[PDB]
């Protein structure tokens, strides 16, 4: 029993973290085989950030201008190239700790683990979700750029996020490992803001199923709803629309608990309309939306890596 | 910016997890140098759990009755001994991945990371706290026994907890790495229950200071309090007494924010009286007690916003 915000074990990613320095800028890099991946803004000064011409700044640089440090060892840069907002530094040493991996782009609502790093040294691991507005509610300080997000499937690490910046509201923005940003963001110092966010409905439903599995049923009722009627109330409370795909995905949890997805939707509707009335669900007074249906099934089954 | 329940990177502990089997029982062990540490109840059947005589069960075992598996490799047991509720299995191979470590016994209120494991394989990492009633609100299924709790400071892993059992209320009990239980618990299936739990006051205060550092001050007031008056009100809401030690420990956060500890105590008193009125503090609708003053200083910026 018990339900916690659980991250994947970080060991396979810790053995890939390095420090990248170019001029006065120091951030983190991801060392896989003989390439070090890092945000391209490592080549910028503070004045360059306003309107940087990355292809012009990069030509000025030679291999020896990039200082890469893996633990207490200097890696020698032998090549460099840019792919979208990610800089790829070819080093003269393949990482002996390179795990089996893939680069994957995730969708809003999907969760992942973040290994927060400073000066190429991992400091902490936490779980988060890609919000519908494409930002993440992370915890990062100056020097955290280049820290990565990932999921593990069997023995394969799927890298899905690289940290680039913090927005004025304290939320974070970054790219996939191919350098494509999540959201309408750019890697410059310009006026940028997170869009209005919404709640991840399929995740709140998954978490309500996790509460039932852990013996919390007070919110269950005898009623049901249609998908259309539920979506009319969900949009009213700034919740993402629930699709037939979300209903299908919740199928197994509905069969394990004996509570149909639209029956759980009726419970969610009443929670939105009446509140919790001094009660909690899994120790929370808010409806939690950062656990996917797969996360709930995995934590209530004991899948190992 | 941001504030998350952050765990330590788990890699150093992942390289120590092994599977220990004795008869029909399989659980996790911690392999450090040439010793595998695990709960002594690995030698018990379900019948034995009512009134086990561990000395009597152990004398009937030989080294070859214990099967230890590290990855896909069998370790050969060459010695065994019991120390309190922990079984120490001497193996003929020192763990080449043994980190720099120490065994530390923690006090209630202290936090640590747990690496939940099944069959010697890590599945997830999460942060938790030793409750005032010496239990932990973990997330553990059958087969998780032997999973460990730890902190990491400057590359040294301090092991503070080993998982032994789940109590009837869904909470968890275990030992330090010398086999001494936290709390009045026994590794016996008997009528034992977690005592009434309380809120960790010094941690709630630390978290209120984390909110001020991150820019939120809505909960402050113009009042102060005496330590005695604060404790009389705190005990009515099931909060632990605040000692002069806790006031001393909060000194640095009081100096970084300019808010005296007894001034923050007055804010906590008012929060207990009024609730949050639809507002949140660091994204929570409840007062959070699983971040220590040390955790807040480690995660938060040294510059207040
Ligand atoms: O100082 C800057 C300038 N940035 C321009 C800029 C423009 C474009 C790009 Cl792609 C990156 C960046 C950098 C950037 O966002 N870095 C950071 C990333 N994650 C967390 C951070 C936490 C504190 C500081 C920086 C952080 C740097 N901003 C700033 C922001 C957020 C707070 S919160 C307190 N101080 C700041 C100060
Ligand atoms: O079946 C038992 C017997 N235990 C007695 C017993 C007595 C003393 C000692 Cl030192 C160890 C143990 C074992 C024990 O607590 N094992 C476990 C440890 N951590 C999490 C667990 C999560 C589910 C299951 C077992 C778990 C075994 N209990 C039980 C409890 C909690 C739920 S929740 C659903 N089923 C159970 C069933
Ligand atoms: Cl302690």
XYZ file of C-alpha atoms and ligand atoms in Angstrom:
685
model
C 0.000 0.000 0.000
C 0.848 3.715 -0.279
C 0.963 6.159 -3.180
C 3.901 8.438 -3.825
C 5.124 10.685 -6.668
C 7.771 8.227 -7.802
C 10.642 8.845 -10.187
C 12.472 6.151 -12.224
C 15.853 5.072 -10.720
C 18.367 7.623 -12.117
C 21.652 5.647 -12.162
C 21.702 5.018 -15.945
C 21.377 8.826 -16.585
C 23.836 9.872 -13.823
C 26.635 8.072 -15.710
C 25.945 10.343 -18.765
C 26.043 13.797 -17.079
C 28.991 16.098 -17.911
C 29.848 19.827 -17.513
C 30.140 21.973 -20.666
C 31.859 25.369 -20.538
C 32.176 27.909 -23.331
C 33.599 31.262 -22.291
C 31.800 32.491 -19.185
C 28.816 30.082 -19.552
C 28.809 26.750 -17.744
C 25.911 24.285 -18.049
C 25.210 20.487 -18.231
C 25.654 18.081 -21.137
C 24.471 14.548 -21.898
C 27.328 12.223 -22.983
C 26.152 9.291 -25.091
C 28.730 7.267 -27.093
C 31.167 9.929 -28.524
C 28.700 12.872 -28.559
C 27.910 15.435 -25.823
C 24.434 17.025 -26.260
C 23.722 20.410 -24.645
C 21.603 23.616 -25.144
C 23.020 25.718 -28.000
C 22.746 28.844 -25.797
C 26.042 27.732 -24.129
C 27.702 29.723 -27.001
C 25.839 32.969 -26.009
C 26.824 35.798 -23.657
C 24.083 37.911 -21.872
C 24.120 40.519 -24.719
C 23.776 37.795 -27.397
C 20.535 36.467 -25.831
C 18.433 39.494 -27.064
C 18.717 38.561 -30.801
C 21.274 35.730 -31.148
C 22.359 34.540 -34.566
C 23.434 31.041 -33.525
C 24.823 30.039 -36.945
C 27.019 33.218 -36.853
C 28.138 32.710 -33.210
C 28.965 29.015 -33.879
C 31.303 29.637 -36.878
C 33.493 31.873 -34.626
C 34.069 28.820 -32.364
C 36.696 26.128 -32.639
C 36.655 22.646 -30.985
C 39.115 23.758 -28.261
C 36.798 26.627 -27.150
C 34.448 23.987 -25.617
C 35.661 22.580 -22.266
C 33.910 19.309 -21.392
C 34.435 17.722 -17.976
C 33.318 14.177 -17.093
C 33.893 13.721 -13.341
C 37.498 14.834 -12.852
C 38.497 14.054 -16.496
C 38.603 16.491 -19.420
C 37.079 15.231 -22.651
C 38.650 16.510 -25.884
C 36.167 18.021 -28.359
C 37.003 16.931 -31.946
C 33.880 18.203 -33.785
C 30.700 20.272 -33.410
C 27.345 20.760 -35.063
C 23.932 22.258 -34.314
C 20.587 20.440 -34.615
C 17.662 22.814 -33.942
C 18.286 24.302 -30.399
C 20.746 21.537 -29.380
C 24.546 21.663 -29.787
C 26.237 18.279 -30.520
C 29.881 18.082 -29.465
C 31.873 15.165 -30.882
C 34.372 14.047 -28.240
C 37.430 11.747 -28.596
C 36.154 9.205 -26.007
C 33.000 7.086 -26.149
C 31.127 7.019 -22.794
C 31.807 3.558 -21.340
C 28.647 3.959 -19.218
C 26.366 4.646 -22.247
C 23.087 2.867 -21.569
C 20.731 1.402 -24.168
C 18.719 4.504 -25.175
C 16.324 6.281 -27.538
C 15.342 9.901 -28.141
C 11.538 10.288 -27.878
C 9.242 13.328 -28.087
C 6.411 13.207 -25.481
C 2.866 14.668 -25.589
C 1.278 16.990 -22.966
C -0.086 14.891 -20.086
C 2.830 12.419 -20.244
C 5.044 12.122 -17.173
C 8.819 11.813 -16.896
C 11.707 11.874 -14.392
C 14.084 14.825 -14.212
C 17.629 14.501 -12.961
C 18.436 18.097 -11.820
C 22.198 18.740 -12.377
C 24.661 21.527 -11.577
C 28.232 21.647 -13.012
C 27.782 18.168 -14.525
C 26.929 16.754 -11.055
C 23.453 15.276 -10.361
C 21.779 16.789 -7.292
C 18.268 15.382 -7.243
C 15.596 13.430 -9.038
C 11.908 14.279 -9.239
C 8.844 13.293 -11.271
C 6.837 15.811 -13.385
C 4.342 16.083 -16.261
C 4.508 18.009 -19.551
C 1.607 20.484 -18.921
C -1.074 21.051 -21.658
C 0.608 24.540 -22.092
C 3.942 22.679 -22.823
C 5.739 23.994 -19.743
C 6.871 21.870 -16.771
C 6.506 22.797 -13.077
C 10.068 21.854 -12.182
C 12.563 22.993 -9.585
C 15.681 24.474 -11.122
C 18.209 27.158 -10.190
C 20.935 28.930 -12.267
C 23.275 26.290 -13.746
C 20.547 23.664 -14.236
C 20.374 24.130 -18.083
C 21.129 20.864 -19.881
C 19.501 18.723 -17.082
C 17.431 15.955 -18.740
C 14.019 14.299 -18.533
C 13.538 10.574 -19.186
C 11.458 7.397 -18.776
C 12.832 3.821 -18.564
C 11.208 0.890 -20.405
C 12.825 -2.466 -19.542
C 16.596 -1.660 -19.821
C 16.140 1.240 -22.337
C 16.312 4.899 -21.311
C 14.016 7.117 -23.404
C 15.321 10.729 -23.203
C 12.420 13.120 -23.721
C 13.477 16.523 -22.350
C 16.472 18.865 -22.055
C 16.139 21.973 -19.848
C 16.733 25.406 -21.490
C 14.956 28.199 -19.503
C 12.695 29.493 -16.704
C 9.661 31.636 -17.606
C 8.554 34.692 -15.496
C 5.915 32.686 -13.578
C 8.594 30.271 -12.246
C 7.727 27.445 -14.703
C 10.205 25.799 -17.106
C 10.665 25.326 -20.851
C 12.914 23.064 -22.895
C 13.352 20.801 -25.912
C 13.259 17.128 -26.911
C 16.813 15.623 -27.511
C 16.566 16.590 -31.220
C 16.456 20.304 -30.130
C 12.755 20.971 -30.908
C 11.102 23.059 -28.171
C 7.973 21.917 -26.400
C 5.618 24.892 -26.796
C 5.840 28.210 -28.641
C 9.123 29.158 -26.982
C 12.452 30.384 -28.328
C 15.986 30.346 -26.819
C 16.410 34.142 -26.551
C 15.941 36.801 -23.841
C 12.648 38.236 -25.130
C 9.092 38.706 -23.790
C 7.796 35.104 -23.381
C 5.012 33.775 -21.155
C 3.348 30.472 -20.363
C -0.124 30.214 -21.832
C -3.173 29.572 -19.623
C -2.876 26.024 -18.309
C -5.512 23.317 -17.975
C -5.915 20.191 -15.794
C -5.050 16.747 -17.299
C -8.416 14.969 -16.928
C -7.308 11.412 -17.837
C -4.555 11.728 -15.154
C -7.008 12.964 -12.454
C -9.208 9.932 -13.293
C -6.184 7.575 -13.079
C -5.332 9.059 -9.625
C -8.966 8.605 -8.470
C -8.580 4.903 -9.487
C -5.291 4.766 -7.508
C -7.243 6.079 -4.447
C -9.905 3.364 -4.824
C -7.168 0.672 -5.089
C -5.608 2.068 -1.860
C -8.957 1.947 0.010
C -10.251 5.606 -0.394
C -13.958 5.315 -1.752
C -15.837 8.232 -0.095
C -16.171 10.096 -3.450
C -17.732 7.105 -5.252
C -21.422 7.538 -6.072
C -24.254 5.522 -7.779
C -24.399 7.869 -10.806
C -23.041 7.801 -14.305
C -22.729 10.385 -17.129
C -22.308 10.575 -20.898
C -18.928 11.573 -22.366
C -20.572 14.696 -23.919
C -22.198 15.847 -20.633
C -18.945 15.227 -18.717
C -16.966 17.307 -21.276
C -19.415 20.232 -20.977
C -18.643 20.419 -17.186
C -14.937 19.659 -17.594
C -14.438 22.622 -19.981
C -16.243 24.873 -17.437
C -13.555 24.008 -14.786
C -10.508 24.430 -17.121
C -10.062 20.660 -17.542
C -8.824 19.136 -20.792
C -11.543 17.363 -22.860
C -11.794 13.611 -22.247
C -11.630 11.601 -25.486
C -12.721 8.025 -26.302
C -8.979 7.206 -26.366
C -8.677 8.274 -22.689
C -11.712 6.083 -21.845
C -10.069 3.111 -23.668
C -6.718 3.706 -21.878
C -8.525 3.677 -18.473
C -10.116 0.249 -19.324
C -7.818 -1.924 -17.172
C -8.199 0.277 -14.020
C -11.972 0.253 -14.577
C -11.918 -3.586 -14.657
C -9.609 -3.932 -11.582
C -11.872 -1.716 -9.440
C -15.276 -2.487 -11.013
C -15.951 1.242 -11.555
C -16.760 2.215 -15.187
C -14.838 5.234 -16.585
C -18.075 7.268 -16.979
C -19.032 6.242 -13.373
C -15.662 7.676 -12.213
C -16.432 10.756 -14.417
C -19.695 11.229 -12.410
C -17.586 11.191 -9.171
C -15.147 13.768 -10.699
C -18.096 15.969 -11.763
C -19.418 16.040 -8.182
C -15.929 16.798 -6.787
C -15.635 19.750 -9.220
C -19.136 21.038 -8.315
C -19.009 20.476 -4.463
C -15.326 20.356 -3.501
C -13.887 17.843 -0.995
C -15.738 19.141 2.155
C -12.710 18.990 4.456
C -11.737 15.542 3.174
C -8.559 14.402 1.369
C -7.849 11.788 -1.356
C -4.464 10.012 -1.080
C -3.371 12.704 1.407
C -4.136 15.605 -0.966
C -6.797 18.411 -0.707
C -6.418 19.109 -4.498
C -7.163 16.803 -7.452
C -3.723 15.493 -8.576
C -3.112 15.396 -12.378
C 0.592 14.296 -12.637
C 0.114 10.489 -12.609
C -0.778 8.827 -15.918
C -2.898 5.647 -16.134
C 0.369 3.754 -16.859
C 2.060 5.303 -13.767
C -0.836 4.108 -11.552
C -0.718 0.571 -13.008
C 3.106 0.479 -12.650
C 3.184 1.710 -9.000
C 0.338 -0.625 -8.018
C 2.209 -3.650 -9.706
C 5.960 -3.290 -8.900
C 7.610 -3.065 -12.360
C 11.451 -3.164 -12.021
C 14.481 -1.862 -14.043
C 12.300 28.762 -9.005
C 9.884 25.927 -8.114
C 9.631 23.601 -5.121
C 9.402 19.855 -5.516
C 9.659 16.788 -3.262
C 13.133 15.883 -4.455
C 14.927 12.579 -3.985
C 18.693 12.009 -4.079
C 20.028 10.500 -7.361
C 19.770 6.725 -6.744
C 22.629 5.322 -8.885
C 25.028 4.745 -5.954
C 22.360 2.598 -4.181
C 21.157 0.775 -7.354
C 24.636 -0.781 -7.689
C 24.213 -2.328 -4.167
C 20.780 -4.001 -4.574
C 20.702 -7.828 -4.645
C 18.053 -10.568 -4.263
C 18.199 -12.851 -1.183
C 16.321 -16.148 -1.142
C 15.967 -18.624 1.713
C 13.549 -21.471 1.015
C 10.295 -20.059 -0.345
C 10.991 -16.434 0.808
C 12.580 -13.938 -1.565
C 13.366 -10.309 -0.591
C 16.035 -7.576 -1.193
C 19.530 -7.241 0.242
C 22.096 -4.446 0.381
C 25.569 -5.518 -0.840
C 28.399 -3.410 0.578
C 32.001 -4.682 0.338
C 31.738 -8.476 1.103
C 28.541 -8.333 3.230
C 24.882 -8.580 2.157
C 22.491 -6.991 4.720
C 18.821 -8.046 4.732
C 15.793 -8.401 7.132
C 16.233 -11.477 9.361
C 12.616 -12.481 8.603
C 13.900 -13.961 5.281
C 14.510 -17.153 7.396
C 10.772 -17.274 8.462
C 7.707 -18.909 6.923
C 4.215 -17.272 7.432
C 3.581 -19.646 10.427
C 6.880 -18.608 12.065
C 5.833 -14.910 12.036
C 3.410 -15.197 14.998
C 6.147 -16.036 17.596
C 9.444 -16.604 15.728
C 12.488 -17.801 17.592
C 15.102 -16.355 15.231
C 18.046 -17.884 17.107
C 16.429 -21.325 16.772
C 15.542 -20.839 13.073
C 19.071 -19.496 12.267
C 21.082 -22.322 13.980
C 19.312 -24.794 11.588
C 20.695 -22.882 8.515
C 23.985 -23.315 6.698
C 25.722 -20.812 4.305
C 24.496 -22.736 1.211
C 20.808 -22.402 2.278
C 21.030 -18.647 1.384
C 20.878 -17.861 -2.352
C 22.137 -14.368 -3.202
C 21.757 -12.996 -6.742
C 23.507 -9.855 -8.003
C 22.183 -9.107 -11.502
C 22.479 -12.425 -13.319
C 25.368 -13.662 -11.075
C 25.085 -15.875 -7.984
C 27.138 -14.755 -5.003
C 28.517 -17.522 -2.761
C 27.650 -17.131 0.939
C 30.665 -17.978 3.149
C 29.378 -16.765 6.549
C 26.311 -15.489 8.404
C 25.397 -13.693 11.565
C 22.431 -11.885 13.065
C 22.710 -8.342 14.445
C 19.408 -7.267 16.045
C 16.694 -7.666 13.272
C 19.218 -7.668 10.404
C 20.860 -10.746 8.889
C 24.476 -10.199 7.679
C 25.589 -12.577 4.942
C 29.322 -12.716 4.237
C 29.936 -13.352 0.474
C 33.160 -14.342 -1.391
C 33.053 -11.250 -3.661
C 33.397 -7.608 -2.583
C 30.929 -5.312 -4.427
C 33.062 -3.428 -6.977
C 30.343 -0.737 -7.083
C 30.490 -0.120 -3.270
C 30.141 3.619 -2.762
C 31.652 5.660 0.067
C 29.059 5.099 2.830
C 28.029 5.302 6.497
C 25.244 3.772 8.602
C 23.296 6.549 10.405
C 20.271 6.277 12.759
C 17.859 9.199 12.108
C 15.349 11.013 14.394
C 11.608 11.615 13.678
C 11.168 14.558 11.339
C 14.261 13.663 9.287
C 13.842 13.036 5.545
C 15.483 10.508 3.193
C 15.080 8.901 -0.241
C 13.751 5.368 -0.673
C 14.765 3.139 -3.559
C 11.766 0.726 -3.802
C 13.046 -2.684 -5.066
C 11.569 -6.094 -6.025
C 13.673 -9.266 -6.603
C 16.890 -7.267 -6.212
C 15.752 -4.893 -9.037
C 15.099 -1.161 -8.389
C 11.692 0.072 -9.517
C 11.409 3.641 -8.280
C 12.742 6.384 -6.064
C 10.787 8.734 -3.779
C 11.277 11.076 -0.850
C 9.763 10.553 2.592
C 10.148 11.401 6.293
C 10.412 9.419 9.532
C 7.041 10.332 11.174
C 6.872 11.350 14.891
C 5.216 7.928 15.516
C 8.376 6.276 13.903
C 6.522 4.930 10.884
C 6.971 6.053 7.234
C 4.211 6.748 4.658
C 5.869 4.767 1.899
C 4.713 3.019 -1.235
C 5.606 -0.655 -0.921
C 4.117 -3.890 -2.228
C 4.856 -7.548 -1.306
C 8.535 -8.299 -2.109
C 9.738 -4.747 -1.193
C 11.291 -5.877 2.168
C 14.982 -5.045 2.284
C 14.525 -1.838 0.165
C 16.594 0.990 1.739
C 16.303 4.655 2.731
C 19.304 6.963 2.373
C 20.669 10.486 2.037
C 23.742 11.492 -0.039
C 25.980 14.349 1.070
C 29.134 15.064 -0.932
C 29.193 11.607 -2.640
C 28.908 9.739 0.707
C 25.763 7.577 0.977
C 24.289 7.552 4.512
C 21.992 4.489 4.850
C 19.342 5.191 7.498
C 16.502 2.740 6.872
C 15.777 -0.849 5.795
C 12.156 -1.836 5.088
C 10.662 -4.684 7.166
C 6.814 -4.443 7.329
C 3.484 -2.825 6.580
C 1.207 -1.980 9.540
C -2.644 -2.388 9.351
C -3.185 1.319 8.548
C -1.073 1.048 5.358
C 2.036 2.701 6.866
C 5.524 1.181 7.043
C 8.013 0.132 9.719
C 11.666 -0.791 9.546
C 15.128 -0.629 11.083
C 18.384 1.313 10.859
C 21.255 -0.657 9.106
C 22.345 -2.090 12.518
C 18.928 -3.873 12.766
C 17.371 -1.644 15.476
C 13.726 -0.841 14.730
C 12.449 2.709 14.641
C 9.521 2.753 17.090
C 8.052 0.148 19.420
C 7.755 -2.421 16.623
C 8.830 -6.019 16.382
C 9.451 -8.252 13.343
C 6.598 -10.425 14.544
C 2.988 -10.697 13.290
C 1.333 -9.372 16.425
C -1.242 -6.721 17.396
C 0.856 -3.673 16.980
C -0.384 -0.486 15.454
C 1.059 2.912 14.630
C 0.554 5.371 17.497
C -1.511 8.556 16.798
C 0.548 10.583 14.308
C 1.340 14.278 14.564
C 2.515 17.039 12.197
C 6.277 17.914 12.119
C 6.114 21.590 13.144
C 9.761 22.533 12.454
C 9.311 21.147 8.872
C 6.041 23.091 8.285
C 7.922 26.255 9.409
C 10.852 25.441 7.066
C 8.358 25.011 4.165
C 6.676 28.367 5.025
C 10.197 29.931 4.798
C 10.663 28.136 1.383
C 7.412 29.862 0.222
C 8.679 33.303 1.320
C 12.010 32.683 -0.511
C 10.109 31.825 -3.682
C 8.066 35.100 -3.467
C 4.919 34.284 -1.509
C 3.973 36.212 1.596
C 0.144 36.171 1.680
C 0.046 34.143 5.003
C 2.143 36.483 7.178
C 0.617 38.784 9.824
C 1.673 41.624 12.177
C 1.753 39.380 15.247
C 4.367 37.438 17.154
C 4.013 34.778 19.880
C 5.858 33.245 22.798
C 7.188 29.690 22.344
C 4.875 28.489 25.141
C 1.718 30.101 23.699
C 2.579 28.717 20.218
C 2.952 25.189 21.671
C -0.392 25.400 23.534
C -2.219 26.251 20.291
C -0.032 23.696 18.140
C -0.895 20.790 20.433
C -4.654 21.430 19.814
C -4.112 20.832 16.053
C -2.035 17.621 16.594
C 1.279 19.382 15.877
C 4.511 18.336 17.545
C 5.901 20.663 20.226
C 8.424 23.172 18.907
C 11.604 23.147 21.004
C 14.366 25.747 21.431
C 16.512 23.409 19.267
C 14.011 23.793 16.389
C 14.085 27.621 16.825
C 17.938 27.527 16.714
C 17.893 25.271 13.597
C 15.541 27.741 11.815
C 18.017 30.624 12.467
C 19.573 30.769 8.960
C 16.172 30.784 7.133
C 14.999 33.511 9.560
C 18.084 35.603 8.603
C 17.742 35.010 4.822
C 14.089 36.175 4.834
C 14.177 38.701 7.713
C 11.233 36.946 9.454
C 11.862 35.900 13.100
C 11.012 32.285 14.002
C 8.290 33.351 16.517
C 6.881 35.775 13.875
C 6.625 32.784 11.445
C 5.053 30.804 14.370
C 2.346 33.496 14.609
C 1.628 33.037 10.850
C 1.398 29.234 11.362
C -1.028 29.781 14.281
C -3.294 31.927 12.050
C -3.055 29.421 9.160
C -4.220 26.672 11.573
C -7.141 28.865 12.679
C -8.315 30.124 9.250
C -7.328 27.503 6.683
C -6.101 28.702 3.240
C -9.339 30.281 1.862
C -8.974 28.838 -1.650
C -5.268 29.741 -1.772
C -2.230 27.480 -2.094
C 1.333 27.688 -0.740
C 3.999 26.257 -3.075
C 1.233 24.515 -5.065
C -0.257 22.735 -2.024
C -3.685 23.191 -0.314
C -2.353 21.472 2.900
C 0.543 22.489 5.191
C 3.503 20.316 4.084
C 5.715 18.671 6.822
C 8.125 16.454 4.832
C 10.837 19.086 4.058
C 13.420 19.756 6.755
C 15.167 23.120 7.293
C 18.264 21.435 5.730
C 16.200 20.327 2.626
C 14.830 23.870 2.074
C 18.334 25.399 2.253
C 19.625 22.671 -0.188
C 16.823 23.117 -2.796
C 15.964 26.835 -2.611
C 17.966 29.786 -3.984
C 20.204 31.703 -1.534
C 18.584 34.923 -2.867
C 15.000 35.643 -1.687
C 12.306 36.828 -4.185
O 18.793 35.524 -15.325
C 18.061 35.132 -16.233
C 18.525 35.154 -17.678
N 18.137 33.974 -18.448
C 17.969 34.320 -19.868
C 17.640 33.116 -20.717
C 17.007 33.286 -21.948
C 16.770 32.212 -22.785
C 17.205 30.967 -22.407
Cl 16.965 29.617 -23.477
C 17.823 30.757 -21.191
C 18.016 31.827 -20.319
C 18.570 31.581 -18.927
C 17.559 30.835 -18.051
O 16.347 30.970 -18.195
N 18.116 30.065 -17.081
C 17.466 29.356 -16.043
C 16.792 28.147 -16.218
N 16.118 27.487 -15.267
C 16.098 28.016 -14.058
C 16.728 29.233 -13.713
C 16.651 29.802 -12.419
C 17.262 30.991 -12.147
C 17.976 31.659 -13.129
C 18.059 31.154 -14.393
C 17.439 29.926 -14.731
C 19.099 32.877 -18.300
N 16.804 34.657 -16.058
C 16.123 34.377 -14.848
C 15.018 33.532 -14.907
C 14.388 33.121 -13.746
C 14.876 33.557 -12.520
S 14.342 33.149 -10.919
C 15.611 34.142 -10.284
N 16.375 34.737 -11.136
C 15.976 34.421 -12.438
C 16.585 34.846 -13.618
O 0.501 -10.377 4.401
C 1.081 -9.813 5.326
C 2.008 -10.578 6.255
N 3.191 -9.828 6.671
C 3.486 -10.085 8.090
C 4.788 -9.460 8.534
C 5.022 -9.275 9.896
C 6.215 -8.753 10.353
C 7.194 -8.439 9.444
Cl 8.711 -7.801 10.014
C 6.999 -8.601 8.086
C 5.778 -9.087 7.615
C 5.487 -9.144 6.124
C 5.119 -7.763 5.573
O 4.623 -6.886 6.281
N 5.393 -7.580 4.256
C 5.242 -6.389 3.503
C 6.095 -5.292 3.624
N 5.902 -4.092 3.055
C 4.822 -3.938 2.307
C 3.867 -4.958 2.070
C 2.717 -4.767 1.267
C 1.838 -5.789 1.056
C 2.053 -7.031 1.628
C 3.140 -7.254 2.427
C 4.085 -6.226 2.676
C 4.357 -10.135 5.836
N 0.969 -8.496 5.611
C 0.265 -7.510 4.882
C 0.435 -6.171 5.217
C -0.188 -5.181 4.480
C -0.970 -5.539 3.387
S -1.797 -4.524 2.247
C -2.307 -5.950 1.405
N -1.929 -7.084 1.888
C -1.156 -6.881 3.035
C -0.546 -7.868 3.807
Cl 18.400 12.851 12.192
